[PDB]
Ligand SMILES: Nc1ncnc2c1ncn2[C@@H]1O[C@H](COP(=O)(O)OP(=O)(O)O)[C@@H](O)[C@H]1O
Ligand SMILES: Nc1ncnc2c1ncn2[C@@H]1O[C@H](COP(=O)(O)OP(=O)(O)O)[C@@H](O)[C@H]1O
C-alpha cells in the first residue's frame with residue numbers, strides 16, 4: 001500500500017496492546033478461518049507496529065547498520081501486506097486463501113531475522129551502554145509470538161498436532177532428536193562429542209512416561225542450543241576422545257512444573273560470569289556455535305509460555321542448565337513485552 | 340555505660356562515617372598487635388553500631404515498638420555506650436586493653452540471642468526483608484570483629500579463621516550435628532555422600548582460608564532442610580535417598596553443592612524460601628524458625644560469596660554455597 005502512511009499506521013496500532021492467547025485458546029481451532037482472520041488481521045498489525053515502534057528506539061549507531069534496516073524493511077512491508085486485508089469480505093474463498101498466501105510470504109520473508117539482526121549487532125564502534133540487550137529480549141519475544149500466530153494459521157488451514165502444537169508431546173523424544181542434531185554438528189567439527197543419558201521422574205505418575213501440551217519446535221530449539229553448548233564445553237575441557245563425560249538429562253514432572261535438567265562436566269563457569277552468559281554481546285567462541293545469542297533467546301522461548309531457563313555452574317567441575325515449563329495447559333499463557 | 344542521654348548525638352556522629360571492610364589477610368595480619376586492634380575497634384565498632392541502629396528506627400512504628408525489638412535496641416545502645424568509654428583511655432596502658440577485651444566479652448554474651456529475639460519480634464505480626472538482611476549482615480560483621488580480638492587477645496587458627504580449612508571436614512561435622520537433631524525428631528534421616536573435584540590440582544583435599552563456624556552454620560542450616568524435606572517426602576525408613584555433597588575447586592570459586600531427593604519446590608516458590616516470614620514448619624525440633632536460609636546466605640555473602648537454591652518440583656533440590664577460593668578476593672562486605 002501507500003507506504004507514507006506507515007508512520008500513521010504504527011501510531012494507530014501502537015495505541016493498542018497485545019492480546020495474549022492461552023493454550024486453550026490456541027488449541028480450540030479444531031474454531032474456524034474467519035476466526036483466525038478476523039482476529040489475525042487486527043492482532044498482527046498490533047503486534048508488528050508495537051515492536052517496530054521499539055525499532056526506531058535503537059541506538060543511532062546500530063539502527064544505521066545495514067542488517068538492521070534490512071529487518072526493518074521487512075516489517076514495513078509485513079504490516080502493509082496484512083493492511084491490504086482490513087476491509088475485505090471474511091466470507092469468500094479467496095479472501096481466506098489470499099490471507100494464508102500473504103502469511104506464507106511474511107514467514108518466509110523473515111526467516112533470517114536473527115542471523116541478520118545478529119549482523120547489525122556484530123558489526124556495530126564500541127562498548128559502555130549495551131542497551132541492545134533490553135530491546136532484543138523484547139524484540140525476540142514478540143518475534144516468537146508472531147511466528148506462533150502465523151504458523152498456526154498457515155499450518156491449520158493450508159502425531160496429531162493442532163498447528164505447531166503437539167497435545168501429547170514426548171519430552172524424551174524431543175530431547176533425543178535434539179541430541180542427535182546437536183551431536184552431528186559436534187562430530188562434524190571436533191570429530192568427538194559426549195554421550196547422552198536420559199532420566200525421568202514422574203511425580204504425578206510414578207511409572208508413566210512424561211508427555212505434555214507444548215510446541216515441540218520451541219522445546220527442540222532450547223534443547224538443541226543447550227546441547228551444543230554442553231558438547232562444546234565438554235570437548236574443550238578434556239584431552240582424550242575416548243573418555244569424554246556423557247551429558248546427563250533429567251526430566252521431572254511435578255504438579256505445577258515440568259523440569260528438564262541438562263548436566264555437563266564441561267568445567268563450569270565462575271559465579272562471576274554466569275549473568276554474562278546471556279549477553280547478546282557475549283560468546284567465548286571463535287567468531288563467524290559462536291554468535292552468542294543461543295542462551296538469551298532460548299530463555300525467551302522458555303518465558304514465552306510462562307517458563308524460564310536458568311544456568312547453575314560449579315567452576316572446575318561442570319554446569320547445570322534447567323528448563324522450567326508449566327505442567328498444566330491451564331497455566332501455559334502467552335508472555336509478551338509490556339502491552 | 341556513658342549517660343544515655345547523649346545517645347542521639349553519638350549515633351549521628353559515628354553514623355556519619357562508613358564501615359571499612361577488612362580483607363581476609365588483614366584479619367590474618369593480627370598474628371598487627373593488640374593496641375592496633377583496640378585503636379581500630381574503638382572507632383570501627385561504634386561506627387557500625389550507630390549505622391545499623393539508625394536504621395532500626397527506620398523500621399515501621401508497628402514492629403519497632405515490639406518488646407523483642409526494643410529489647411534488642413536497648414542492647415545496642417548499651418554496647419555503644421560501653422565501647423565509647425574507651426575513646427579517651429591510654430592505648431599504651433595495660434589496663435585499658437584488658438578492660439576492652441573484658442567489655443567485648445560482655446557485649447558478645449549480651450548479643451548472643453539477638454536472632455531468636457528478633458524472630459520473636461517478627462512473630463509479633465513486607466520490606467521488613469530489606470532491613471533484616473542488612474541488620475543481620477551488619478551483626479555477623481560485628482561478631483567477626485569482636486571474636487577476632489577476644490580469641491586473638493587474651494590452635495593454629497587466627498581468631499575464628501582457619502588458614503588450612505578442610506571443607507569436607509566441616510561438611511562432615513555439620514552433617515552429624517544436623518543428623519543428630521533429625522533422628523531425635525523423626526528417628527530417620529538421609530545418609531551422606533561426599534565428592535570433590537579439585538580442578539586446580541586433581542587429587543588433593545580441598546582446603547581454604549575461611550571461618551569454620553561460618554561454613555559450619557551454612558551447611559548446618561541446609562542439611563536440616565534437606566533431611567527434613569527427604570523424610571517428609573518418603574514413606575519408608577529403610578530406603579531413604581542419601582544427601583550428596585559435591586566439593587568443586589576452581590581458579591576463582593570454591594563450590595559446595597548439597598543435593599537432596601526431598602521432592603523439591605515449584606519455581607514459583609523459590610524466592611519465598613529466603614523470606615524471614617516464610618517457613619513450611621510450625622512457628623516453633625528441626626524447623627519452624629524460618630530464618631535458617633536467609634541468614635545462611637548472609638554468612639556466604641559476608642566474605643564475598645553467595646548461596647543459591649535450585650529445585651526441580653517432583654524430584655529434589657540443589658543447595659549451593661559459593662565462596663572465593665583465593666584469600667586475595669575475600670574481603671568482608673557490609674551494609675551502609
Ligand atoms: N554448559 C556450559 N559450560 C560452560 N560454558 C557455557 C555453557 N553454556 C554456555 N556457556 C558459555 O556461554 C557462552 C554463550 O552461550 P551461547 O548463547 O550458547 O552462545 P554461543 O554458543 O554462540 O557462544 C558460550 O560461548 C560459553 O562460553
Ligand atoms: N531442600 C529443600 N527442599 C524443599 N524445601 C526446602 C528445602 N530447603 C528449604 N526448603 C523450604 O524453605 C523453607 C524455609 O527454609 P529455612 O530458612 O531453612 O526455614 P525453616 O527451616 O525455619 O522453615 C522451609 O520451611 C522449606 O519449606
Ligand SMILES: [Mg+2]
Pocket residue numbers: 225228229289290292293294295
Ligand atoms: Mg550457543
Ligand SMILES: [Mg+2]
Pocket residue numbers: 560563564626629630631632
Ligand atoms: Mg531451616
